[PDB]
């Protein structure tokens, strides 16, 4: 199979955020569009056969609309390298930033899948992370109220693997970024698979915001414009 990746220190994975389904922005230590028509190699590291089959299943949905294909392989150094490290959050580098990640590290992680995971949850989270793998950013419609973060909790969550974000890192990279609307679309698309989920595990009111679980009309149109036939 694939050569194993360097080990995650499971002590750096922060405990006590059970059922926190957070997409983490991640940045390489230091254009993201793939060449059009690319066939991108993907390797899966760990996970059960069931979980790995679901990832394949939903990732490849993007190719219905984009002129990009994912070739799931078990040899060499795949271009996208997917782990299943529990509790680390889910994430992907953006687009061709994957190609900047050392070969012994992952480029994508799914932090909460198991063999009881719903089809909708696989669809939502897999398509979403693969959206970032194609270069899409979060859609975030900033609410009029502002977000009621439990700042203590937010600091604790983002302090560990993979970000290792200090308090100032969190204030600049998280609160600042998500204090205003963020979009890649002309009109906002409440339906986008790329919407940024705000977990109630990180807020104070029980406030949460969720993700749509399938590709929107706008998602389908945008990605075909980026990667046309
Ligand atoms: Zn995301």
- For the chain, domain boundaries: 1-229
Cα 75 to middle of ligand 1, angstroms: 28
The answer on whether 128 is annotated among ligand-binding residues is yes
Residue 142 annotated as lining a ligand binding site: no
Three-class SS state of 100: helix
CA dihedral 80, 81, 82, 87 (to 10 degrees): -120
Contact 24, 163 (CB under 8 A): yes
Classify residue 145 as exposed, middle or buried by CB count within 10 Å of its CB (0-12, 13-18, 19+): exposed
Q: Which is it for strands 108-109 and 80-83: parallel, antiparallel or unpaired?
A: parallel
Tokens of 210: 């969720």
Which residue reads 């609410």 in tokens? Answer: 143
Q: Cα(142)–Cα(49) distance, rounded to whole angstroms? A: 38
Q: Is the peptide bond before 3 cis (omega within 30 degrees of 0)?
A: no
Angle between helices 49-59 and 119-134 (to 10 degrees): 60
Sheet holding 91-92, edge to edge: 69-73, 39-45, 80-83, 108-109, 91-92
In terms of Cα–Cα distance, which of 29, 192, 21, 203 is closest to 117? 21
H/E stretch holding 102: none
Q: What is the resolution of this structure in A?
A: 1.6
Cβ atoms of 139 and 183 closer than 8 Å: yes
Separation of CA 157 and ligand 1 centre (Å) = 16
Q: What is the DSSP string of 27-46?
A: ------PPPTT-EEEEEEES
């Amino acid at each position: 199979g694939l050569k194993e990746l360097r080990a995650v220190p499971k002590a750096d994975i922060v405990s006590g955020f059970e059922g926190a389904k957070v997409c983490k922005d991640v940045y390489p230590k230091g254009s993201t569009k793939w060449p059009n028509g690319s066939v991108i190699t993907v390797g899966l590291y760990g996970g059960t056969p069931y979980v790995r089959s679901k990832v394949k299943q939903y990732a490849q949905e993007w190719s219905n609309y984009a002129n990009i294909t994912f070739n799931f392989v078990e040899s060499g150094t795949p271009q996208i390298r997917v782990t299943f490290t529990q509790g680390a959050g889910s994430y992907s580098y953006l687009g061709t930033q994957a190609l900047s990640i050392p070969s012994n590290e992952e480029t994508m992680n799914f932090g909460w899948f198991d063999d009881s995971t719903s089809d909708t949850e696989f669809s939502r989270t897999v398509i979403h992370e693969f959206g970032h793998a194609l270069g899409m950013i979060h859609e975030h419609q900033h609410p009029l109220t502002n977000i009621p973060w439990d700042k203590n909790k937010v600091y604790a969550y983002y302090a560990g693997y993979p970000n290792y974000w200090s308090k100032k890192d969190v204030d600049n990279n998280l609160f600042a970024t998500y204090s205003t609307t963020q979009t890649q679309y002309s009109a906002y698309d409440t339906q986008s698979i790329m919407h940024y989920s705000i977990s109630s595990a990180l807020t104070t009111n029980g406030f949460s915001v969720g993700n749509n679980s399938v590709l929107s009309a706008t998602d389908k149109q945008f990605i075909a414009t980026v990667y046309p036939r």
